[PDB]
Design a protein around this ligand. Structure first.
Ligand SMILES: Nc1ncnc2c1ncn2[C@@H]1O[C@H](COP(=O)(O)OP(=O)(O)OP(O)(O)=S)[C@@H](O)[C@H]1O
Ligand SMILES: [Zn+2]
Lengths: 50, 50, 149, 108, 54, 96, 50
């Protein structure tokens, strides 16, 4: 299938409201195709702490 | 010897379209940062998918 | 009369002269959040939240059908209904059960969609949402993750 | 028998009212064309009174300047704290304004 | 900065930093670490010291 | 053909109309015309410079209405003495 | 037989006024809105806050 590594800090960009758009870019790649594989790793970089 | 031939080209800007008016383009547009741009289309377009 | 405090108006460069108040500028994100999909989650499909279904339907859907029943008695329906609790009891399910068993213009609204970068869009978008649901006067209005805004 | 004097008075009423109202909207819109003399200003706020004729204004995106009045813009009114309208070329003060800021003071 | 007599290096409230000269008028003990300074536009040179905030 | 140093004698009215018309032409870079006399290659005296109306699109030759010229100079035909439009002017009123 | 012809000629007296006032409407309106088309063909229409 289409396998996608995800560096968590590819969401952590500098400017205001851009990693949100990075999630948008992710879902744009996702809904182009079929059976694709997003692989997260190190989601503490993304974070689970409020 | 092909340089000066390409010198009358143009620095024309890519954009992103806000809406379409009815019965006419009358398109409103933003590029990135400046403003929200009221434009025409050129005559040799496919006026459907703008 | 088209002017008020807080107006995006479209202004010439060289004159700096006002020409339009941006009158017909409903964006793709503005019109995508409107609901034309009409989900179908049944009340019987949800179990055990009996009195919460009571409060929900009998205090939102009865203003949709009986305003005069508040007027025959001389009271006034509440404005503002809030859900909260643990993130597994089913919260979005109740808004979807509203969308199913009522037809009075269900309007979703997602939270971080209102987080803007082109600045000035989300407030305009909320005003567009209430204007649009005002156009279909009984307004079923839902927002998830209100804490995110 | 002389209703052509009222077909002339009615022509006066209809044609003159319509052409006069079209040329009246054209008078006010020729004045809107005359507003291509009233071509833009800037707005800033007086930050201090530099000298009796000078003021430091606040371009709301940025820098700070030295200005004057038009001629008779009441230099005692332009206290530090007022908002003024600034000229486009000369950049000096054109017209005072009210307003102030965040409605967390206002909504309470 | 002044590299020598009357040749400045000047920051602005446009943010950036420039390299101009200053006049033959201004006293050299008005800029002694700094000042709120008055700058021209085309010539863009140091003219005057604004009154500090105090 | 051959070239020899061209000289622009100015009418001082042209100096006044340039300063006034660009002064009114506040930042918006007005267009006007130059109306003069063909003496030779190496000199020109301009005798008249009048005003042209403000156009907010873009400073162009297509804003030059020739029937505006016809009507204005038609009024100027018996008024004094008309000549050829020999040029034009635009403005940059803040910088050099 | 004399006042009716006076009103007949006064109809043309008012029709000349119709011609000139419709000129002050229409020919001036062409001036106004040609200037306003000259303001309606710009780079943006810059969004702002009133
Ligand atoms: N009464 C119920 N009957 C059937 N499934 C239920 C019921 N209550 C909850 N669920 C299930 O719980 C989930 C729905 O809860 P949620 O989708 O988390 O609602 P919610 O709005 O997301 O809550 P949070 O705080 O936002 S995560 C789905 O898996 C449902 O199938
Ligand atoms: Zn110029």
């Amino acid at each position: 299938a289409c396998f996608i590594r995800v560096i968590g800090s590819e969401l952590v960009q500098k400017y205001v409201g851009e990693g949100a758009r990075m999630v948008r870019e992710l879902f744009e790649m996702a809904r182009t195709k079929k059976a694709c594989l997003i692989f997260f790793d190190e989601i503490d970089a993304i974070g689970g702490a409020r | 010897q092909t340089l000066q031939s390409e010198q009358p080209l143009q620095v024309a800007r890519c954009t992103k379209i806000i809406n379409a008016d009815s019965e006419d383009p009358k398109y409103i547009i933003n590029v990135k940062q400046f403003a929200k741009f009221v434009v025409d289309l050129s005559d040799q377009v496919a006026p459907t998918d703008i | 009369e088209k002017l008020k405090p807080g107006d995006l108006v479209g202004v010439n460069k060289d004159s700096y002269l006002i020409l339009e108040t941006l009158p017909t500028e409903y964006d793709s994100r503005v019109k995508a959040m409107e609901v034309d999909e009409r989900p179908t989650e049944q009340y019987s499909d949800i179990g055990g939240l009996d009195k919460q279904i009571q409060e929900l339907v009998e205090a939102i859907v009865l203003p949709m059908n009986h305003k005069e029943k508040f007027e025959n008695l001389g009271i006034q329906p509440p404005k503002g209904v809030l859900m909260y609790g643990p993130p597994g009891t089913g919260k979005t399910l109740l808004a979807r059960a509203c969308a199913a068993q009522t037809k009075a213009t269900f309007l979703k609204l997602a939270g971080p969609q209102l987080v803007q970068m082109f600045i000035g869009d989300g407030a305009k978008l909320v005003r567009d949402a209430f204007a649009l649901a005002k156009e279909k006067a009984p307004s079923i209005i839902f927002i998830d993750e209100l804490d995110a805004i | 028998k002389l209703l052509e004097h009222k077909e002339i008075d009615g022509r006066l009423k209809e044609l003159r009212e319509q052409l006069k109202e079209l040329t009246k909207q054209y008078e006010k819109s020729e004045n809107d064309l005359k507003a291509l003399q009233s071509v833009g200003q800037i707005v800033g706020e007086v930050l201090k009174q530099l000298t009796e004729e000078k003021f430091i204004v606040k371009a709301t995106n940025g820098p700070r300047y030295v200005v004057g009045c038009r001629r008779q813009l009441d230099k005692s009114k332009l206290k530090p704290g007022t908002r003024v309208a600034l000229d486009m070329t000369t950049l000096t003060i054109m017209r005072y304004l009210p307003r102030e800021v965040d409605p967390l003071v206002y909504n309470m | 900065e002044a590299v020598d007599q009357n040749t400045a290096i000047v920051g602005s409230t446009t943010g950036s930093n420039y390299y101009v000269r200053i006049l033959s008028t201004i006293d050299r003990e008005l800029l002694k670490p700094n000042a709120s300074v008055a700058l021209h536009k085309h010539s863009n040179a140091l003219v005057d010291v604004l009154p500090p905030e105090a | 053909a051959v070239d020899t140093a061209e000289q622009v004698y100015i009418s001082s009215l042209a100096l006044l109309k340039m300063l006034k018309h660009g002064r009114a032409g506040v930042p918006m870079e007005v267009m006007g015309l130059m109306l003069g006399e063909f003496v030779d290659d190496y000199t020109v005296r301009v005798i008249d410079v009048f005003a042209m109306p403000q156009s907010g699109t873009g400073v162009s030759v297509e804003a030059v209405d020739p029937v505006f010229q016809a009507k204005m100079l038609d009024m100027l035909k018996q008024t004094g003495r008309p000549e050829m439009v020999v040029g034009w002017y635009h403005s940059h009123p803040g910088f050099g | 037989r004399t006042r009716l012809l006076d009103s007949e000629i006064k109809i043309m007296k008012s029709e000349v006024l119709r011609v000139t006032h419709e000129l002050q409407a229409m020919k001036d309106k062409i001036k106004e809105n040609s200037e306003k088309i000259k303001v309606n063909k710009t780079l943006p229409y810059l969004v702002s806050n009133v």
